[PDB]
């Protein structure tokens, strides 16, 4: 496992780019984050161990392991839902649309962490690592999205910190493999 650079937005710099925010809500069913699952693609995954070795090769196959850890106080509670959406359109726009695909419900307690497995659902035996559309039309190989929503709410005692952080880990599963070595563009 290695950490994902998930909070990659303009005003966010250094170690702060590894944290996902949570906070106490005043309305229902809201969205926490989204990302494309494609491991060789430019974006949050590209700096990870799994990302750097995938950028040494042209083709990939196998299941992925995504794992999340909660870093609030002992007294903080909540539940969240994490979903994988296979290819065919845009990212799902609501919690009803997301929960029709592969998903988990996570309850924060003693065991700090949870795994979602993104299983290999593909037409062919392998996919391309780039998704670059200007020459080879390789957007053909796009692999789907992962998204996170509130199931209930984050709840705290009086005078506590009303904002908390999650950390996100990615790794390959034992059916994973790579073909055709090429020069790392970084």
């Amino acid at each position: 496992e290695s950490l994902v650079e998930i909070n990659n937005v303009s005003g966010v710099e250094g170690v702060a780019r590894y944290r996902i925010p949570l906070n106490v809500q005043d309305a229902m069913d809201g969205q926490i984050m989204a990302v494309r699952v494609d491991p060789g693609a430019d974006g949050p995954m590209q700096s990870t161990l799994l990302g750097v070795f995938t950028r040494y090769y042209t083709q990939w196959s196998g299941s992925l392991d995504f794992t999340f850890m909660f870093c609030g106080t002992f007294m903080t509670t909540g539940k969240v839902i994490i979903a994988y959406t296979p290819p065919g359109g845009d990212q799902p726009g609501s919690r009803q649309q997301a929960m029709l695909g592969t998903h988990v419900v996570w309850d924060f307690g003693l065991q700090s962490s949870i795994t979602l497995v993104v299983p290999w659902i593909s037409s062919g035996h392998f996919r391309g690592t780039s998704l670059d559309n200007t020459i080879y039309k390789y957007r053909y190989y796009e692999a789907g999205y992962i998204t996170m929503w509130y199931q209930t709410n984050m709840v705290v005692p009086p005078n506590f910190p009303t904002e908390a952080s999650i950390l996100m880990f990615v790794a390959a599963q034992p059916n994973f493999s790579l073909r055709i070595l090429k020069d790392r563009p970084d």
């Binding site: 919690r95 419900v105 065991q111 209930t152 005692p157």
Partner: protein, 236 residues
């Protein structure tokens, strides 16, 4: 034990403050037998496309909260391939897995009864509306919780399958229901076999300044399903 994991089709649920699992009338869901069957055409059994968890929109436990309910299979009649199979066929049969979630700190107190009732009619009024009798996936409010909406004492609801969520002890409730009727199969659009009711019996209170906004969330799976009599799609 207090930990649990439920897995159906492409879906999984976890909890860390459970209180066992109830299996209604000591029976799990099961198939229709050759001695008990009547319709002669070959049934459809969709498998993992129908038999998986769906999550309904959430409800807030307000100051004024009297309670809320859902009808099965009405609530899931327009969701996914459970919905489409139910519209295209004349007859349906099947059981349910149900999981209710509500979390709050060690600085909160309150208690909910979570109860599944067979053949529950709404009858505080001369003529129930279609809105009150089939409220869809949003559900509807209890206006008469003490008489259980039906002219019986609330206190005697524990003859039906139930659990409690007591905020000092647990944060979730789990029920498994088999198919119940006086016939082997029935219309999905004209008759509701079960109702799921959630009623506060001790009101929500907390240490001054604690988080006030507390949702309740319902997640449901069809289980052991079969359909007969295919035609065009039809709805009420």
């Amino acid at each position: 034990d207090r930990v649990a994991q439920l897995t159906l089709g492409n879906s999984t649920i976890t909890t860390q403050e459970a209180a066992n699992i109830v299996v209604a009338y000591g029976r799990w869901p099961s198939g229709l037998r050759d001695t008990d069957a009547t319709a002669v055409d070959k049934p459809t059994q969709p498998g993992v496309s129908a038999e998986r968890f769906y999550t309904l929109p959430s409800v807030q436990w307000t100051t004024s909260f009297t309670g809320h309910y859902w009808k099965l299979p009405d609530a899931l009649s327009d969701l996914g391939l459970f919905g489409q199979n139910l519209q295209f066929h004349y007859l349906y049969r099947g059981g349910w897995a149900i999981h209710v979630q509500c979390n709050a700190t060690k600085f909160h107190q309150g208690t909910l009864l979570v109860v599944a009732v067979p053949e529950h009619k709404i009858q505080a009024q001369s003529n129930p509306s279609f809105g009150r009798t089939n409220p869809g996936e949003a559900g509807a409010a209890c206006q008469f919780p003490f008489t259980f909406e039906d002219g019986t004492a609330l206190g005697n609801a524990l003859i039906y399958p139930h659990q409690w969520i007591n905020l000092r002890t647990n944060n979730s409730a789990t029920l498994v229901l088999p198919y119940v009727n006086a016939i082997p199969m029935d219309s999905g659009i004209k008759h509701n076999n079960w109702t799921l009711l959630v009623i506060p019996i001790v009101p929500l209170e907390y240490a001054v300044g604690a988080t006030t906004f507390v949702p309740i969330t319902v997640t449901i799976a069809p289980m052991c399903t079969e359909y007969n009599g295919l035609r065009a799609a039809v709805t009420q």
